[PDB]
RNA sequence: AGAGUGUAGCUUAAAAGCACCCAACUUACACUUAGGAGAUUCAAUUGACGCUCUGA
């Protein structure tokens, strides 16, 4: 065949922190929270303070908030571990706490007479294996990383090809578990990056149309 | 009548129907009955998940077997400076779907997994012994 | 052995009075069901773009399947296969600080 | 022994193979909806339309009217359309509607009825009545000029003559008051 | 003169001479009274600019209450004055419906129709 | 995208009002959950 | 560079009928009730903007 087989990876850390509620969304947030306030029977609480304010009544005739107080500064003490990592990374797009609400995939720049540009990561069809066992070796063929991941299943994701005898590209897809990147300082520039910021890397046909499979819902 | 080229123009029996455990296709290939549990702490979200659940199968034609609950469990956190406490309960939806195409299960399940909410897990497992 | 807390528990009985201002305001209701018509609106632009992913994806992977019978066969024979070592799937939602 | 049938069988192209992943009418209206499709459906059988309905000639009635008024649909349509926008942007609108509290000018919806649809449905109303049938032998033509008649009761009444509604001979004593829009050099013919 | 007696397995019944039938499609309203024949008296939709120009919606209760009024006024106009309706139990408990025939009962039109002197 | 089932009450006829409440993990994550009392904030051993 | 072309998701529909979205009900679905958002790529059959397909 005047083809050549090559797979890649879509190796994707998944959004960490919850995305921020939108203009509009918030107010449907306040006003379930009042409808919910509005239709709720039976607070413990709001017992315990209802039925001392009346005996207190009694015996200022003839508490719950000091709780409320209580867990108020208890948690005005407590810090949030923050989540404005644009703040903590600057614009550190090779580190894996970037932007933590958005999906984040690998890219690593190689070289390459057509193109000495970033790719997602790949292989070649060697004739003892299944495409899903070349992404497998990626895995093993990065730069040292502890990179731990789940495979979503044995089925490709993309055909990008190019004629120069053609470099069938046979995208795949997988999930980062756990894993992370040794030697931070790594070499070889792998950058971790949106399909918004897949314009500073991907120009074209075979590398630019990946925003078919790449998913940022 | 029978003898007659309108017989049977009033069956009914046919268009009706009335009386798989790890199925497969061999060539091609399609998942078993497969369990999507989305426990959470909040009876809330984990509800309204599985809801969501619920109406993307039916707009996706896979098909739902049945939407059951499992258990609730009410754990107790005790901690010191006997301890006070904390009573926590973790609620349980799960949705049973049949049919799944081996192609399909990509989609669907990137799908699920990005939308998850906050704090509640999916766990798809196959009905074996989980009664 | 099933039981549920569908059921309603006894104490819910007669203390509901914490809440007895069902009265409402006419600016109120305008600007609930105002509120409600516009999240009508955002909810059918939001399954619209979870239709398109939708639809863009399995584009792709029916794309490879033309492109991998245009190659081989055999390698189509494993792009279907119930790979049975990703079913058991866990994946925990997205939390609200990070660790 | 069996007959073959004369033509289709009525549920004959619904697949019986995925017969649970074919999908079904949940609601008693769809069916009703493809019920009467298939009951107003031609059909090779012996029918209550072939028993009980009217078999009138299709000779494709005659018309013998004056031609149908010209519009341009574009501007038309835009305008239509820009009328909605302005409607659908007053707020007080979509109060009212929310409300339920909103009405529609019967007397300006009648005026523009006479003038858009109103010949059409003159029309139906006289093939109901049976009209053309005794008039014109079946020919039908469509009254594109509003004819006003009215009668003179009282001093200050008139009962006018619609549309088939009933007007006694104390009403119809003397002659109507008649009035067609009409332009200068036109003859015309009036009949009862 | 004879209604159509029979059809007491099925529905709707065909004993009328006249029938208000009510179509609410997902975007519009049409009321129609149709004769026993099959043909069609008298109709009023919101597919017309005549009731277009004046609603807001298309689809809503006010847009069966006016289209109660529209064809009150053509049934009035035209004759009509009897009819039978014949609704299904979720169009009688819904409230378009209700404004309908309430637009049309107090417009003139009587939605039950006199009994046959059979003798 | 965890926002689409997010938005959500409680569809139940008779329920008390849960107050929200952000629940640290072990390792320092916060979520937020429905509690009985406003404890603004409860903690995971 | 050249061809199939061109009504919102779909229609040997002509501004329609279904699909679709949110609330109430339902564990949920479904049904139902109330609401909702929409289209004719542009100039007097061709002419010139957008998708797909082919090649360099």
Redesign the interface.
């Known amino acids: 065949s005047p083809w050549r087989l090559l797979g890649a990876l879509c190796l994707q850390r998944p959004p960490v922190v919850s995305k921020p509620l939108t203009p509009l969304q918030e107010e449907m947030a306040s006003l379930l929270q009042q409808i919910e306030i509005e239709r709720s029977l039976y607070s413990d609480h709001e017992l315990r303070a209802l039925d001392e304010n009346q005996r207190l009544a009694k015996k200022k005739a003839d508490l719950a908030q000091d709780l409320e107080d209580m867990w108020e500064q208890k948690f005005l003490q407590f810090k949030l571990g923050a989540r404005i990592t644009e703040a903590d990374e600057k614009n550190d797009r090779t580190s894996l706490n970037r932007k933590l609400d958005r999906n984040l995939v690998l890219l690593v720049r190689e070289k390459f007479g057509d193109q000495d540009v970033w790719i997602l990561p790949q292989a070649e069809w060697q004739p003892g294996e299944t495409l899903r066992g070349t992404a497998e070796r990626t895995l093993a063929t990065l730069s040292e990383n502890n990179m731990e991941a789940k495979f979503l299943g044995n089925a490709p994701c993309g055909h990008y090809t190019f004629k120069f005898l053609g470099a069938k590209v046979f995208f795949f897809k997988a999930l980062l578990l756990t894993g992370d990147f040794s030697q931070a300082g790594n070499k070889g520039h792998h950058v971790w990056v949106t399909k918004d910021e897949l314009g500073d890397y991907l120009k074209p046909k075979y590398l630019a149309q990946v925003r078919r499979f790449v998913s940022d819902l | 009548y029978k003898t007659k080229p309108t017989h049977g123009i009033g069956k009914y029996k046919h268009l009706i129907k009335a009386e798989v455990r790890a199925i497969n296709l061999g060539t091609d290939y399609e998942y078993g009955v497969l369990n999507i549990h989305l426990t959470a702490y909040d009876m809330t979200l984990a509800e309204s998940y599985a809801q969501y659940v619920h109406n993307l199968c039916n707009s996706l034609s896979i098909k739902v077997e049945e939407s059951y609950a499992m258990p609730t469990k009410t754990i107790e956190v005790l901690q010191l400076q006997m301890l006070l406490d904390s009573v926590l309960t973790t609620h349980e939806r799960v949705v049973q779907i049949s049919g799944l195409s081996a192609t399909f299960a990509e989609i669907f399940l990137e799908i699920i997994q990005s939308s998850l909410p906050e704090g509640v897990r999916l766990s798809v497992k196959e009905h074996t012994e989980e009664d | 052995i099933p039981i549920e807390d569908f059921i309603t528990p006894l104490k819910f009985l007669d203390k509901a009075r914490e809440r007895p201002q069902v009265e409402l305001t006419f600016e109120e209701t305008e600007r609930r069901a105002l509120l409600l018509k516009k999240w009508s609106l955002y909810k059918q632009q939001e399954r619209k773009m979870e239709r398109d992913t939708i639809r863009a994806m399995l584009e792709a992977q029916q794309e490879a399947l033309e492109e991998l019978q245009l190659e081989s066969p055999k390698l189509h024979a494993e792009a279907i296969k119930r790979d049975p070592n990703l079913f058991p799937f866990e994946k925990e939602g997205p939390h609200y600080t990070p660790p | 022994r069996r007959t073959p049938p004369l033509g289709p069988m009525p549920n004959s192209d619904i697949d019986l193979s995925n017969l649970e992943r074919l999908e079904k009418y949940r609601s008693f209206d769809r069916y009703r909806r493809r019920a009467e499709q298939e009951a107003q459906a031609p059909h090779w059988w012996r029918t209550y339309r072939e028993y009980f309905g009217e078999k009138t000639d299709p000779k494709e009635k005659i018309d013998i009217g004056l031609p149908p008024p010209k519009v341009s649909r574009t501007q038309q349509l835009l305008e239509r359309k820009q009328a909605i926008q302005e409607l659908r942007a007053n707020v007080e609108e979509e109060r009212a509607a929310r409300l339920r509290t909103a009405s529609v000018p019967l007397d300006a919806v009648r005026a523009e009825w006479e003038r858009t649809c109103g010949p059409y449905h003159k029309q139906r109303l006289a093939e109901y009545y049976g009209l053309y049938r005794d008039l014109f032998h079946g020919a039908t033509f469509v009254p594109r000029v509003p004819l006003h008649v009215a009668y003179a009761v009282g001093e200050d009444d008139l009962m006018p003559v619609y549309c088939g509604n009933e007007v006694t001979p104390t009403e119809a004593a003397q002659a109507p008051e008649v009035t067609y829009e009409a332009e200068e050099g036109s003859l015309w013919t009036l009949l009862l | 003169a004879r209604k159509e007696r029979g059809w007491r397995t099925v529905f709707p019944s065909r004993e009328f001479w006249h029938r208000l039938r009510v179509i609410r499609t997902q975007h519009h309203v049409e009321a129609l009274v149709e004769h026993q024949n099959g043909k069609v008296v008298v109709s009023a939709s919101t597919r017309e600019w005549a009731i277009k120009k004046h609603l807001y919606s298309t689809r809503n209760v006010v847009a069966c209450e006016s289209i109660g009024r529209v064809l009150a006024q053509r049934c009035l106009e035209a004759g009509i004055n009897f009819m039978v309706y014949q609704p299904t139990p979720w169009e009688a408990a819904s409230d378009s419906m209700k404004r309908l025939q309430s637009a049309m009962t107090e417009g003139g039109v009587v939605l039950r129709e006199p009994q046959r002197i059979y003798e | 995208?965890?926002?689409?089932?997010?938005?959500?009450?409680?569809?139940?006829?008779?329920?008390?009002?849960?107050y929200?409440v952000?629940?640290?993990?072990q390792?320092?994550?916060?979520?937020?959950?429905?509690y009985?009392?406003?404890?603004?904030?409860?903690?995971?051993?």
């Open positions: 995208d965890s926002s689409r089932a997010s938005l959500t009450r409680v569809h139940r006829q008779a329920y008390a009002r849960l929200p952000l629940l640290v993990k390792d320092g994550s916060t979520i937020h959950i429905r009985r009392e406003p404890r603004r904030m409860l903690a995971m051993p």
